C-alpha cells in the first residue's frame, strides 16, 4: 500500500523541466538540504553552478529516458535515467544519471550532488567551455556583390545604471516604451537577466529606420548580424534566417542550441552549405583545471559562399519596375542559361523578418491577398498569348502552318461551331485578312486557334512533348513541373484552341517560360536555366527547327517596329528587340468579372545577349508589362551583349 513512488518520479521530473527551460532557482528549490547524505552545496551554490555550466553553454532540449524510481529504506529512494541535451556545440546524448532522494513532510527532494550536473562529476570538478563561432557564409552574385552577408546593425539597448533609480527608472522606462513601440515588461525582463551587470548594455531592439530622441539610459550600438542589401526586391529568392528551436535540433542533433537557421529561399536551400561548423571544447577538468573528461570537440569551419548567376542591379531594376503590384519578372542569357534577375512583387521586409518582426507585421504579410511570400518566379501560371509563338513554331516544323495562308475574320470572336454553345475565342484588333506575321503583331487569338484545331491535338502535342513539361529542373528552388493540361488528352476541341493561344490548362512558371523561350534564341535548341555560377550548361536540341525560328524572330522584330505592333511603345528606346506581348484571362467565382494577366517576352536579336520575361498580374487600366519594361531593357541592352 505504497504510492510515493508517484511523487518521486514526479520529482525528477519536474527538476529535470526546470532546468529544460532555465529555471535554475526552481530546479534548486527542489533539493534537499545540505549535508554529509543530501547535497552536497547550499541551494544558492546549486543555483550558481547551473546557471554557470547549463547557462553558459546554453543547455536545451533537455531529454530523458528509461525513468527508474526504486526504494532502498523508508527515508530515501534511488532513481537513475538516461538522458540527452543539446549545447551550443550539438547535441550530447547517452548520458546516464543516478542519484537518491529524502522523503519527509509529504515532499520529496533530490539529494544533490555534482553528478546531476553531468555525469562522473564528483567533489568540487568543473567545466570549461571554450566557443570558435563560425562565420556565415555568403550569397553573392555573378559580380561577387552581396546579397546575404554580415551587416553593422542598429540595436538599442538600455544600460540599466544609467536608468536612474525608483520613480526616475519608471519614468525612463516609460519613455522608452513609447519612443520605440515595446512593453515595459518586455524592458524589464531584460534588465533581470542574470549576466546583466550595472554598467553593461542590454540589447532590447533592431532599429530600422531613424533613431527617435534617446531618453535617459537608451543607447544605440551598431552590432554584427545577417544583413539583406537588396532588402525586399531579393526576398523570396534569398529568403531569410531565423533563431535555431528545439524542432530544428530533433532533427539535426549536429545544430548548436543558439545559432542561426534560413527559413526559406536559398538561406535554407544552402543552409547546411552555408552555415559550416561551430567551433570549441566542452570539458570536465577536476578542481585544478586538469582536464578530465571531453564532452564535445568541434574544429570551427566557416561556411562557405555561394555565388548566384544573379546581377544585383538587374535584380533591383527588375523589381522596381514592377511598382509594388502583383507580378514577375525573370531574365537571363539565353545562351547559357545565367538567371539574372528573380524578382517577384509584392515582397516583404527580409531584414525586419530576420530582425525580429511583430506578429501583426508578419500576420499583415500572410493574410495580404496579393501573397508577397510567394515566389512568383516558380509559381505555375498559364503564360498567356505570348505562348502563340510556340504554336507558331510547332505548325511551321509539322507543315500545318503555312505562313503565307490568310485567314478572313470578322469581328472580335469566333468559335468553330454551335457546339461551342456560347463561349467563343475573342481577339482584341479586327484586322479581317490575317497570316502568321499580323497574328503576331496583333497578337490574334483567333487566328492561332483556328491553326492549332486545324492541326489537331495529336501534331500538337508532338511538338510540345519536344519541350519540357513534365521535367523537374536542377534549381535550387522548389517548384512544380511544367504540364500542357491536367490530363494526357484535352478531350475538347475548346480546351485544345485555348490551349494554343496559351490559356485553358496550361501552367508554367516564369523560369520555365524561360527555359522554353530560349529556342528563339539558339537556333531551335533549348537552353537549360541555371543559377549556380560555376553550373556547367545544359541544353537540349532540335526542340524546333531552325526554319521556324528563322521565320518567326523577324515578326517578332515587327512586333516592335511595326506601328501595329503590340510592342510598338518600346522602339522609342532605339535597340534591337525581338518581342512577343501577350494577355491571360482566367475566371472568377467572387469577382464575377475575369481579371487579366499581362505579359512580355523580349530579347536581342542581334546578339542573343539577354531575355526576359514579365508578366503584371490582374493589370489595371492601361498598365502593361510592356509599359513598365524599358528600363530593365535598356540595362541588359548595355550590359548583356
Known amino acids: 500500500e505504497t504510492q510515493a513512488v508517484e511523487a518521486g518520479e514526479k520529482t525528477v521530473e519536474q527538476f529535470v523541466q526546470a532546468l529544460n527551460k532555465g529555471d535554475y532557482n526552481k530546479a534548486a528549490e527542489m533539493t534537499s538540504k545540505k549535508a554529509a547524505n543530501k547535497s552536497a552545496l547550499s541551494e544558492k551554490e546549486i543555483l550558481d553552478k547551473y546557471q554557470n555550466i547549463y547557462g553558459a553553454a546554453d ?53 544533490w550532488q555534482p553528478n546531476l550536473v553531468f555525469p562522473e562529476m564528483e567533489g568540487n570538478d568543473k567545466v570549461s567551455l571554450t566557443t570558435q563561432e563560425a562565420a556565415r557564409g555568403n550569397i553573392i552574385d555573378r559580380n ?21 533609480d525608483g520613480g526616475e527608472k519608471t519614468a525612463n522606462i516609460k519613455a522608452i516604451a513609447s519612443s520605440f513601440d515595446l512593453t515595459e515588461d518586455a524592458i524589464n525582463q531584460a534588465i533581470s537577466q542574470s549576466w546583466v551587470q550595472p554598467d553593461y548594455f542590454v ?15 537608451a543607447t544605440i550600438q551598431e552590432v554584427d548580424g545577417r544583413y539583406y542589401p537588396l532588402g525586399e526586391a531579393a526576398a523570396q529568392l534569398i529568403g531569410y534566417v531565423g533563431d535555431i528551436t528545439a ?104 531584414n ?47 507543315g500545318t502552318i503555312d505562313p503565307n495562308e490568310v485567314l478572313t475574320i470578322n ?46 491535338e495529336k501534331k500538337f502535342r508532338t511538338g510540345l512533348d519536344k519541350f519540357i513539361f513534365g521535367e523537374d529542373l536542377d534549381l535550387p528552388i522548389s517548384m512544380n513541373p511544367a504540364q500542357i493540361s491536367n490530363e494526357d488528352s484535352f478531350n475538347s476541341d475548346i480546351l485544345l484552341a485555348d490551349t494554343g493561344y496559351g490559356q485553358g490548362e496550361l501552367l508554367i512558371n516564369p523560369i520555365q517560360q524561360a527555359a522554353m523561350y530560349s529556342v528563339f534564341a539558339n537556333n531551335g535548341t533549348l537552353v537549360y536555366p541555371k543559377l549556380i555560377a560555376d553550373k556547367e550548361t545544359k ?22 517596329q511595326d506601328v501595329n505592333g503590340t510592342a510598338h511603345s518600346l522602339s522609342a528606346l532605339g535597340i534591337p528587340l525581338a518581342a512577343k506581348t501577350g494577355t491571360a484571362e482566367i475566371k472568377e467565382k467572387q469577382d464575377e468579372k475575369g481579371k487579366e494577366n499581362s505579359f512580355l517576352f523580349a530579347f536581342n536579336p542581334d546578339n542573343q545577349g539577354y531575355m526576359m520575361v514579365s508578366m503584371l498580374e490582374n493589370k489595371e487600366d492601361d498598365d502593361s508589362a510592356t509599359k513598365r519594361a524599358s528600363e530593365l531593357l535598356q540595362y541588359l541592352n548595355q550590359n548583356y551583349q
Open 539 to 560: 541544353d537540349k536540341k532540335n526542340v524546333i527547327g531552325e526554319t521556324a525560328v528563322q521565320t518567326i524572330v523577324p515578326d517578332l522584330r515587327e512586333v516592335v
Open 247 to 350: 524542432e530544428d535540433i530533433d532533427k539535426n542533433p549536429e545544430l548548436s542550441s543558439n545559432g542561426k537557421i534560413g527559413r526559406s529561399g536559398l538561406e535554407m536551400a544552402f543552409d547546411k552549405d552555408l552555415r559550416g561548423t561551430t567551433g570549441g571544447k566542452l570539458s570536465i577538468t577536476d578542481a585544478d583545471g586538469v582536464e578530465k573528461k571531453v564532452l564535445i570537440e568541434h574544429e570551427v569551419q566557416n561556411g562557405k559562399d555561394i555565388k548566384l548567376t544573379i546581377d544585383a542591379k538587374a535584380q533591383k531594376t527588375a523589381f522596381d519596375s514592377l511598382g509594388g503590384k502583383a507580378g514577375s519578372t525573370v531574365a537571363t542569357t539565353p545562351k547559357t542559361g545565367d538567371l539574372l534577375a528573380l524578382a517577384s512583387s509584392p515582397s516583404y521586409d527580409p
Open 59 to 111: 543547455v536545451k532540449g533537455l531529454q530523458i529516458s528509461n525513468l527508474k524510481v526504486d526504494k532502498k529504506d523508508d527515508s530515501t529512494y534511488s532513481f537513475s535515467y538516461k538522458a540527452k541535451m543539446n549545447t551550443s556545440l550539438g547535441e550530447l546524448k547517452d548520458l546516464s544519471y543516478k542519484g537518491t532522494l529524502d522523503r519527509n513532510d509529504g515532499q520529496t527532494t533530490i539529494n
Open 144 to 164: 561577387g556583390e552581396p546579397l546575404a552577408t554580415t551587416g553593422k546593425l542598429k540595436q538599442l539597448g538600455v544600460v540599466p545604471s544609467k536608468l536612474g
Open 352 to 398: 525586419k523578418m530576420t530582425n525580429g518582426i511583430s506578429q501583426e507585421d508578419y500576420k499583415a504579410y500572410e493574410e495580404n491577398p496579393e501573397q508577397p511570400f510567394i515566389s512568383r518566379f516558380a509559381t505555375g501560371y498559364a503564360p498567356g498569348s505570348t505562348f502563340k509563338m510556340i504554336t507558331a513554331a510547332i505548325g511551321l516544323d509539322n
Open 411 to 456: 469581328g472580335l470572336k469566333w468559335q468553330k461551331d454551335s457546339s461551342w454553345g456560347s463561349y467563343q475565342v475573342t481577339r482584341v484588333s479586327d484586322v479581317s485578312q490575317v497570316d502568321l506575321k499580323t497574328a503576331l503583331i496583333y497578337s490574334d487569338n483567333i487566328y492561332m486557334a483556328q491553326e492549332t484545331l486545324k492541326m489537331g
Open 203 to 217: 540589447p532590447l531592439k533592431i532599429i530600422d529606420g531613424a533613431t527617435p530622441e534617446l531618453p535617459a539610459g
